[PDB]
Amino acid sequence: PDKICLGHHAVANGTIVKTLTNEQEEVTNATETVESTGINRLCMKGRKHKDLGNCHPIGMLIGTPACDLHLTGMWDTLIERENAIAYCYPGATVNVEALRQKIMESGGINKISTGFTYGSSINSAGTTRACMRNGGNSFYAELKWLVSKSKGQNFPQTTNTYRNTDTAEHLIMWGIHHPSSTQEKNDLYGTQSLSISVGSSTYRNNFVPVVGARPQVNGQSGRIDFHWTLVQPGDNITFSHNGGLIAPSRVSKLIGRGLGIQSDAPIDNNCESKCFWRGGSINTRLPFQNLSPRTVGQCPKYVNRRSLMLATGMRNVPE
Amino acid sequence: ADPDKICLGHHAVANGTIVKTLTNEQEEVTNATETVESTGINRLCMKGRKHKDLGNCHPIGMLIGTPACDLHLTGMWDTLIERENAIAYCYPGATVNVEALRQKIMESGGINKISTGFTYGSSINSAGTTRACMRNGGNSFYAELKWLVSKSKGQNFPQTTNTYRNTDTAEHLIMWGIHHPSSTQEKNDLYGTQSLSISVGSSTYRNNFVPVVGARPQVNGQSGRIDFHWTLVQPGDNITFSHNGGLIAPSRVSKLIGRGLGIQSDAPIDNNCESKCFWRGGSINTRLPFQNLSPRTVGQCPKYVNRRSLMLATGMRNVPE
Amino acid sequence: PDKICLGHHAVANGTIVKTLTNEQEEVTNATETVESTGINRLCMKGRKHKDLGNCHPIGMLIGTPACDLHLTGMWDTLIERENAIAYCYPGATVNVEALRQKIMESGGINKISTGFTYGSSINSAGTTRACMRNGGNSFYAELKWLVSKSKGQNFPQTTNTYRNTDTAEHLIMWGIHHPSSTQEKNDLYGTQSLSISVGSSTYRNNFVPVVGARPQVNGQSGRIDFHWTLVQPGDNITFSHNGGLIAPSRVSKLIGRGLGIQSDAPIDNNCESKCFWRGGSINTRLPFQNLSPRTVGQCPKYVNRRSLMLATGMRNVPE
Amino acid sequence: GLFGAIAGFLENGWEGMVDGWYGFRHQNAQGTGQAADYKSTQAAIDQITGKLNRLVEKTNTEFESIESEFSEIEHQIGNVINWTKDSITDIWTYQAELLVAMENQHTIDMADSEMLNLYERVRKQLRQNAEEDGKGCFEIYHACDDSCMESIRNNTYDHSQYREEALLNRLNINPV
Amino acid sequence: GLFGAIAGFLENGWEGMVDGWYGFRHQNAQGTGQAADYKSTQAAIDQITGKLNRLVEKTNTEFESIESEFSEIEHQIGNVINWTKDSITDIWTYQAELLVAMENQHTIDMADSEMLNLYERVRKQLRQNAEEDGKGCFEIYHACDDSCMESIRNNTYDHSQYREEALLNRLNI
Amino acid sequence: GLFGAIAGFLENGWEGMVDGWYGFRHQNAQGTGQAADYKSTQAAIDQITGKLNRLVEKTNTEFESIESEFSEIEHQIGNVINWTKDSITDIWTYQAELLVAMENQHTIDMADSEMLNLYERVRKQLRQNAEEDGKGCFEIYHACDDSCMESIRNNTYDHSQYREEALLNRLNINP
Numbered sequence A, C: 001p002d003k004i005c006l007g008h009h010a011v012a013n014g015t016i017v018k019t020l021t022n023e024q025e026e027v028t029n030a031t032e033t034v035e036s037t038g039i040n041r042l043c044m045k046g047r048k049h050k051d052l053g054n055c056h057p058i059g060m061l062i063g064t065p066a067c068d069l070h071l072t073g074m075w076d077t078l079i080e081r082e083n084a085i086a087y088c089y090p091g092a093t094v095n096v097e098a099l100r101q102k103i104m105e106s107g108g109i110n111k112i113s114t115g116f117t118y119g120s121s122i123n124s125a126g127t128t129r130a131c132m133r134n135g136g137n138s139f140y141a142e143l144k145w146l147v148s149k150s151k152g153q154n155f156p157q158t159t160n161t162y163r164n165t166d167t168a169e170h171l172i173m174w175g176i177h178h179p180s181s182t183q184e185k186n187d188l189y190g191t192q193s194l195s196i197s198v199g200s201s202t203y204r205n206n207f208v209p210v211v212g213a214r215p216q217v218n219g220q221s222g223r224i225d226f227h228w229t230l231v232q233p234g235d236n237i238t239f240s241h242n243g244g245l246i247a248p249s250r251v252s253k254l255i256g257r258g259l260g261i262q263s264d265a266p267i268d269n270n271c272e273s274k275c276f277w278r279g280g281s282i283n284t285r286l287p288f289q290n291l292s293p294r295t296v297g298q299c300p301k302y303v304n305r306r307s308l309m310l311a312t313g314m315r316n317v318p319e
Numbered sequence B: 001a002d003p004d005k006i007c008l009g010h011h012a013v014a015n016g017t018i019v020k021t022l023t024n025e026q027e028e029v030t031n032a033t034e035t036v037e038s039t040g041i042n043r044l045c046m047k048g049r050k051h052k053d054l055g056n057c058h059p060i061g062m063l064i065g066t067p068a069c070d071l072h073l074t075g076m077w078d079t080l081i082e083r084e085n086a087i088a089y090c091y092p093g094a095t096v097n098v099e100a101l102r103q104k105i106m107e108s109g110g111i112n113k114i115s116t117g118f119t120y121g122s123s124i125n126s127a128g129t130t131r132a133c134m135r136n137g138g139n140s141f142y143a144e145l146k147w148l149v150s151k152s153k154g155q156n157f158p159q160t161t162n163t164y165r166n167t168d169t170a171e172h173l174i175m176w177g178i179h180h181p182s183s184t185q186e187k188n189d190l191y192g193t194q195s196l197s198i199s200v201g202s203s204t205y206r207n208n209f210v211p212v213v214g215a216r217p218q219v220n221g222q223s224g225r226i227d228f229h230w231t232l233v234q235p236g237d238n239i240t241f242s243h244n245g246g247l248i249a250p251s252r253v254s255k256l257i258g259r260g261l262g263i264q265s266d267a268p269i270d271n272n273c274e275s276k277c278f279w280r281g282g283s284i285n286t287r288l289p290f291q292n293l294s295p296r297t298v299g300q301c302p303k304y305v306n307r308r309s310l311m312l313a314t315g316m317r318n319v320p321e
Numbered sequence D: 001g002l003f004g005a006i007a008g009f010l011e012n013g014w015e016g017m018v019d020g021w022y023g024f025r026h027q028n029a030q031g032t033g034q035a036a037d038y039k040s041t042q043a044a045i046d047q048i049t050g051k052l053n054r055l056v057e058k059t060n061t062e063f064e065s066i067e068s069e070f071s072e073i074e075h076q077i078g079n080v081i082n083w084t085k086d087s088i089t090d091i092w093t094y095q096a097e098l099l100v101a102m103e104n105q106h107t108i109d110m111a112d113s114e115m116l117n118l119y120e121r122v123r124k125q126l127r128q129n130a131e132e133d134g135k136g137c138f139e140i141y142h143a144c145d146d147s148c149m150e151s152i153r154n155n156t157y158d159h160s161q162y163r164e165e166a167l168l169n170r171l172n173i174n175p176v
Numbered sequence E: 001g002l003f004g005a006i007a008g009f010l011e012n013g014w015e016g017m018v019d020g021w022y023g024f025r026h027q028n029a030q031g032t033g034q035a036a037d038y039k040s041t042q043a044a045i046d047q048i049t050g051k052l053n054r055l056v057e058k059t060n061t062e063f064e065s066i067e068s069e070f071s072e073i074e075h076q077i078g079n080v081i082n083w084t085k086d087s088i089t090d091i092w093t094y095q096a097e098l099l100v101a102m103e104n105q106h107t108i109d110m111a112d113s114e115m116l117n118l119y120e121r122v123r124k125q126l127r128q129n130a131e132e133d134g135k136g137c138f139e140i141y142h143a144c145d146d147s148c149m150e151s152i153r154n155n156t157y158d159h160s161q162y163r164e165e166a167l168l169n170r171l172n173i
Numbered sequence F: 001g002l003f004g005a006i007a008g009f010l011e012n013g014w015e016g017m018v019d020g021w022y023g024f025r026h027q028n029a030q031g032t033g034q035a036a037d038y039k040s041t042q043a044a045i046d047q048i049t050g051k052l053n054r055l056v057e058k059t060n061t062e063f064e065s066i067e068s069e070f071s072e073i074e075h076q077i078g079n080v081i082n083w084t085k086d087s088i089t090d091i092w093t094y095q096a097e098l099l100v101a102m103e104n105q106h107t108i109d110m111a112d113s114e115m116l117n118l119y120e121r122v123r124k125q126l127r128q129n130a131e132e133d134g135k136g137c138f139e140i141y142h143a144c145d146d147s148c149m150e151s152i153r154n155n156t157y158d159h160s161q162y163r164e165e166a167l168l169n170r171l172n173i174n175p
């Protein structure tokens, strides 16, 4: 007799997906849930960004020549590049990574003069070939290399106090010079025993310059180790020293919030993005990605899978 | 006649509630119930807990014996409550690995104190006091420490050795201080002109400290500082202090006993509600598996989620007439 | 009327499992998903392993007698035992746990001579009863205890530089001796003020021997504190010292990757495994385990449950 | 829905049925009436109840604070802690979203299935004495008084009692 | 499958049906024909679409870096970070595997159910005028021309119109 | 249950059916008998098996220790590690609870569906020659010998062979 038959559609080539019971289930259609493709550029549209270039974030606070255009500023996004320079004169900073993270988490930097002054037997204009500027020997912009005005003379016992009169905490950095020979130490600060004491109401510490033979870095066997702390509003911090202090001429103030990115990818001011990594940006609607476990911003979650297909159709049952 | 009939059906309600499913964000069902707790109790629910409210005493002050902590030098508790702006230091200073130490204390079920038995020769004055630590309207000092200075002003503090021997079957926590004077004159008055050195040594620990003169702002009228240090002395071990001025020596050591729950909150205590979950704002008593009050909680808590509400259906699809 | 009836199987005693709606659902069969049983042995088949025995990993670098058979080697698996010895002469190491983890993450160690040599007024063969070897006073194999050749004489101002001429970073360790009395320090190094400075192009530090009364450990009131850093390829590291330095005669080189295990379980070279813990090995196909939250290798995930039964059959409906 | 009844071939629910989740309406010579079905209602409710009790099962894991409310946290470790906590929170937020979405899907479909199970049970009781109208009713081809209706709800309806009358009516073979 | 239709009592799908997911083929005196069913197709598609929109809902959680790409990380903290990240990654990998497996199971079975719902709808329309052949067809016991077939697809088929003719044919009386 | 058969309109299971998960019992002039259905049994079993194989798939992520078994861990970092590990453990414990609950629900209901799929298959084979009794049986309105019963189980039963006999018997007016 007459007849009406019910049925469903199918396709010649379906796609494979996984279910609870079957690793190899064929369906009519499916779509990817794991993003494999990123953008090999830094998508900065809509962001007031600062590209530090060859300037390392820590160099912003102490004022390395490479950071001359980055001593102050405002930004919602801060970009660090590989092999950026923090030190012209060789040295190291205590809790360097904590400090770098503070800066890369900020929305800008301001600088405030310490107002430090020095008596006539101090030369506060110490320079070095390690920090060139305009084809001449120079120094960290935000610091002063104090040495005896007369070569060999004992550096005078000296006291300098920074007073934070702001309503927000300030970040103060200073250096301690560690000479490469006793002759050098004597030339710069005299033969007396050297000591630098630092004290606020919250911070207390002491430093001693130390002579030692060392490899040259940028032509220098000497070293300047850097230290930092936070000065609270209304607090004073006092430097008590008789040679070896690399004193601050300005302190820093980290303002607001910003997103910190480490990448060498070129900036594109026409795409926008919320997710970044070493290789660039990630713009995707997909909830997962397999590009990198080291991302910043608002990102899809990293998973160790090339592909996870989500079925968008019924079982495929071809003819 | 033509047919009678019986019809099958299900119930419905005038106003159903919206819930989410796998396929629909806006699915209407007959009934639903919340899975995320929004409401906490703005009090510390301490019923069934032998608790200690430290008040204005900071946990670290218990070990060194700040006046504010005089009623908290020893004790037993299953729950320890720290308040904002609690005092650890009367004489200004700082402690090394302060946060680790605070966490040890806030993880303990009580403190006991054991005398070091330290004694000093006649050229040492072990009764140093200060206006920074008042007690009974008089100059005093940390209860568990002694400020050692030369008996004769300006004299060199004698080379001195003091050894604490842990004869217990459990580890003890020993604290000491190092005084850092505000001027060379002051240092000379207290300890003499010799170069000063404090060495500390057990079979597990070795360290050395040097008092350092430096100009500093006054805190509680003091430009001087006392920095604190600590370590653990194992059962049967000896720890030896070798010093010639600047040591703030322990008269007693501490012993952290058992386990307890540490809470940081200014919420008022309520001894009539009980709870297993606490945060800055108070307590959380809920049967619900999730909460959106705070990601910083302590105890046995529902898991924090960034959602105002997640409704669980307790009925069928609502299909009104 | 004839009849055909449809039905399903059942069993006399079914097993209980949990579902979304029922904690007490009876089914015909079920199987465990949480492993309760481990192997109380270290399953080392297919692994080139090193059992350190009584030698602590840090003792490998400095050369404690207990580690004499473990000064170099290659391994894909390294086994540390409880109460292993790192120090014969008492002392401590700075950032000891970081260093231990580096070693327990390595696939072998090589040793390279520093080539350090000393003038005639230095005795570089200092030994101690604390480090016995062949029934005689000895010292850490990879270090040299430098003292004045003439008792009481001032130890000469001395400079030693290690140059890494390899293409990979080397790990250099040294010690600082802290005497138990002023008499002892004077005997060994003289009455001068003592100072040890260490400097590469990446590292700078300085150390001062310190006299102090202390309990005896292995008959010694003295102490030797250990320090370490990494020397990069092509870099030089310079020791500048006048008494108190325990100098390196060899540096270390961590090679490749390996799996580090802490366990006292006996080795079994006939079972193989990918998962280890304090108590031994875990060989299971099950995705979960309740043996321990502290495991190493490729392991099932730890869960706080004695049992979680997975149904392998229908609802049981007995007669 | 999955089982085709609720929000399916049943056009709507009955707001007037307040004493049960599922039930019957009838029409006969004596009039109309309504009654709830206890068993199907309890089956649905017990599954919802069992689900709710599973959700109260809580962790017995005691957690300590690792972030001081009243003092400074060193910046690097503070950042590590923050990263870890926010990762954990994203995991739990996602889990809760999924749990509820999945449970709700199951709850809805389970209820649909219990409606269908009742429908099917009645279809089989009635055997050859009734026909489905497609809207959830069974047109019964014999006089079925209030007791007869009750016997259908009570599951004691004997189809062979009415079979002859019903087949004649279904075929339109009733003698003049 | 769960509902017994797709890859079940329906032997296979129809590659030639490109204008819908579900539908009808018929045979009568005039010939054969095919047509898609809009409602069942939309029911399936809307559920898939709703599922996809739920999956785009993203985190608004801003994360900072805790691992420097361009400088050294201290070894112990670096190891803690690595352990933590790999644990998190294993959690998310597992979650994604489960999510997709579960959704796919549900998607497949939902589609099966919508096929069955259409089948059941037609069974009830046809009432006593047709019988099931077990392969998804209804043998209709009266002459059912193209309009009659359309009325079945359109859901306006009145069974009482053809009942008498159909019962006679079904019984041969 | 979801599909209404197992622990549903089927009053109980058959403990005596040991050679399959689903099957048939019959009654005719020759007597009674039992036989398992291979296809439905395999459908159920294959889905359980496939599920078990998915659950063996393990991580290939190598983890190092971050907690020394034999030496001290600094207290702050130790507490951070503990907090992190216990959070991870709570996540995995919850996941395992959910996984198993969900899989078990699905397994149970899948088995119910395969029973129903067999029932429906037989209903359609028998067409107009039999009626359902509501307990899972089909009363067959013609003489159906052991071969005829086998043809139903074997899926080769041709309803048109017996249709006329069966319709006459179904239209019987009984006492």
Ligand SMILES: CC(=O)N[C@@H]1[C@@H](O)[C@H](O[C@@H]2O[C@H](CO[C@]3(C(=O)O)C[C@H](O)[C@@H](NC(C)=O)[C@H]([C@H](O)[C@H](O)CO)O3)[C@H](O)[C@H](O)[C@H]2O)[C@@H](CO)O[C@H]1O
Pocket: A125, A126, A127, A128, A129, A130, A137, A145, A147, A179, A180, A184, A188, A218, A219, A220, A221, A222, A223
């Ligand atoms: C302009 C000038 O005074 N000297 C030129 C040299 O800079 C240059 O050779 C470099 O000299 C380096 C050491 O000398 C300095 C330096 O850093 O450049 C000279 C600085 O004035 C002195 N600064 C202060 C504040 O005293 C500085 C300091 O003593 C040490 O850095 C402390 O350790 O040392 C070094 O040897 C480099 O290798 C070299 O490039 C020569 C080239 O012939 O020309 C000079 O005119």
Ligand SMILES: CC(=O)N[C@@H]1[C@@H](O)[C@H](O[C@@H]2O[C@H](CO[C@]3(C(=O)O)C[C@H](O)[C@@H](NC(C)=O)[C@H]([C@H](O)[C@H](O)CO)O3)[C@H](O)[C@H](O)[C@H]2O)[C@@H](CO)O[C@H]1O
Pocket: B127, B128, B129, B130, B131, B132, B139, B147, B149, B180, B181, B182, B186, B190, B221, B222, B223, B224, B225
């Ligand atoms: C009432 C009394 O005993 N002394 C009065 C002096 O306090 C006051 O000079 C003031 O001295 C202040 C610090 O004084 C102490 C302290 O901390 O209170 C006095 C302690 O006896 C002394 N303790 C010990 C063990 O040495 C202590 C200690 O030297 C320092 O804290 C070390 O840093 O100092 C404070 O500095 C005021 O700024 C200062 O004016 C004099 C007035 O000249 O009158 C005394 O009656």
Ligand SMILES: CC(=O)N[C@@H]1[C@@H](O)[C@H](O[C@@H]2O[C@H](CO[C@]3(C(=O)O)C[C@H](O)[C@@H](NC(C)=O)[C@H]([C@H](O)[C@H](O)CO)O3)[C@H](O)[C@H](O)[C@H]2O)[C@@H](CO)O[C@H]1O
Pocket: C125, C126, C127, C128, C129, C130, C137, C145, C147, C179, C180, C184, C188, C216, C219, C220, C221, C222, C223
């Ligand atoms: C010179 C000598 O060996 N004298 C004998 C003493 O050893 C012994 O008194 C004991 O001295 C112990 C320390 O002895 C050594 C050691 O550790 O073995 C001897 C080492 O040669 C010496 N090494 C160097 C490089 O100087 C070493 C070193 O000075 C210290 O360890 C530095 O801290 O010391 C130990 O202190 C015992 O407690 C002490 O009784 C006496 C009695 O047996 O006989 C002496 O002939």
Ligand SMILES: *[C@@H]1O[C@H](CO)[C@@H](O[C@@H]2O[C@H](CO)[C@@H](O)[C@H](O)[C@H]2NC(C)=O)[C@H](O)[C@H]1NC(C)=O
Pocket: A105, D074, D075, D076, D078, D079, D082
């Ligand atoms: C870790 O996260 C918390 C919460 O986001 C941060 O807390 C903020 O800290 C600053 C203090 O410097 C305050 O001004 C903010 O108001 C705090 N917000 C809250 C909600 O507490 C903390 O800064 C973070 N730590 C680091 C190192 O980034």
Ligand SMILES: *[C@@H]1O[C@H](CO)[C@@H](O[C@@H]2O[C@H](CO)[C@@H](O)[C@H](O)[C@H]2NC(C)=O)[C@H](O)[C@H]1NC(C)=O
Pocket: C105, C257, E074, E075, E076, E078, E079, E082
């Ligand atoms: C933490 O994990 C990272 C990533 O796996 C490690 O970095 C790699 O280390 C290998 C040496 O085994 C290098 O050759 C690679 O270049 C590194 N890869 C990346 C992406 O950085 C890192 O060493 C680990 N840290 C610790 C302390 O184990």
Ligand SMILES: *[C@@H]1O[C@H](CO)[C@@H](O[C@@H]2O[C@H](CO)[C@@H](O)[C@H](O)[C@H]2NC(C)=O)[C@H](O)[C@H]1NC(C)=O
Pocket: B107, B259, F074, F075, F076, F078, F079, F082
């Ligand atoms: C981190 O957790 C571990 C494991 O729970 C703690 O180690 C235990 O300490 C308790 C004391 O309360 C002892 O009873 C056990 O001997 C220890 N168990 C193990 C397995 O070692 C450890 O104390 C915790 N660390 C911190 C810093 O809180």
Ligand SMILES: *[C@@H]1O[C@H](CO)[C@@H](O)[C@H](O)[C@H]1NC(C)=O
Pocket: A029, A030, A031, A312
């Ligand atoms: C397959 O899936 C995606 C998402 O539903 C869709 O955009 C695409 O058009 C589909 N392909 C088909 C129906 O062929």
Ligand SMILES: *[C@@H]1O[C@H](CO)[C@@H](O)[C@H](O)[C@H]1NC(C)=O
Pocket: A215, A216, C163, C201, C234, C235, C236
């Ligand atoms: C290390 O020393 C060698 C030999 O003196 C020298 O040629 C090389 O440049 C030095 N490397 C440094 C200073 O980094």
Ligand SMILES: *[C@@H]1O[C@H](CO)[C@@H](O)[C@H](O)[C@H]1NC(C)=O
Pocket: B031, B032, B033, B314
């Ligand atoms: C809805 O469900 C909750 C939890 O099951 C119950 O306590 C409440 O009584 C219900 N509300 C209504 C209006 O039925």
Ligand SMILES: *[C@@H]1O[C@H](CO)[C@@H](O)[C@H](O)[C@H]1NC(C)=O
Pocket: A163, A201, A234, A235, A236, B217, B218
């Ligand atoms: C800082 O110095 C000013 C005077 O220059 C003084 O009035 C103020 O109180 C000082 N602050 C502190 C904290 O000592």
Ligand SMILES: *[C@@H]1O[C@H](CO)[C@@H](O)[C@H](O)[C@H]1NC(C)=O
Pocket: B165, B203, B236, B237, B238, C215, C216
């Ligand atoms: C502590 O000193 C006593 C003094 O006799 C000694 O017996 C004991 O062994 C010492 N403890 C040590 C070395 O651990």
Ligand SMILES: *[C@H]1O[C@H](CO)[C@@H](O)[C@H](O)[C@H]1NC(C)=O
Pocket: C029, C030, C031, C312, F052
């Ligand atoms: C369940 O028990 C059966 C016995 O029927 C046993 O053979 C089997 O090993 C168990 N299940 C699985 C999946 O292995």
Ligand code: NI
Pocket: A105, D079, D082, E064
């Ligand atoms: Ni941050």
Ligand code: NI
Pocket: C105, E079, E082, F064
């Ligand atoms: Ni590692």
Ligand code: NI
Pocket: B107, D064, F079, F082
């Ligand atoms: Ni703890």
